[PDB]
Structure 1
Amino acid sequence: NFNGLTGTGVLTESNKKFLPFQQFGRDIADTTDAVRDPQTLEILDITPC
């Protein structure tokens, strides 16, 4: 429930280059792939079950 974005999967650390204005990561499906934790400002990752 990262500010919405209901889903399910696996969360793990990433090595992305999220710029200070960059918030959400996407792949070529218009589906989320990387998200930043609002409460810690950390670059997570989402992996399907």
Structure 2
Amino acid sequence: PFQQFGRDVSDFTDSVRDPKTSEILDISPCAFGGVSVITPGTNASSEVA
């Protein structure tokens, strides 16, 4: 009841009560990463995934 926001083990904001009402949760981390390109070979074809 006295805790508004809460961090994680990595010291990052994870969730916080809605400051207005409804006493609900909050954001979650978005999607990211390293996009890779798969090519069977330019000598054979030109496909890409």
TM-score by length of 1: 0.47
- Answer 1 or 2: which has greater strand percent: 1
Q: Choose between structure 1 and 2 for higher RCO, CA contacts under 8 A separated by at least 6 residues.
A: 1
Higher CA-based Rg: 2
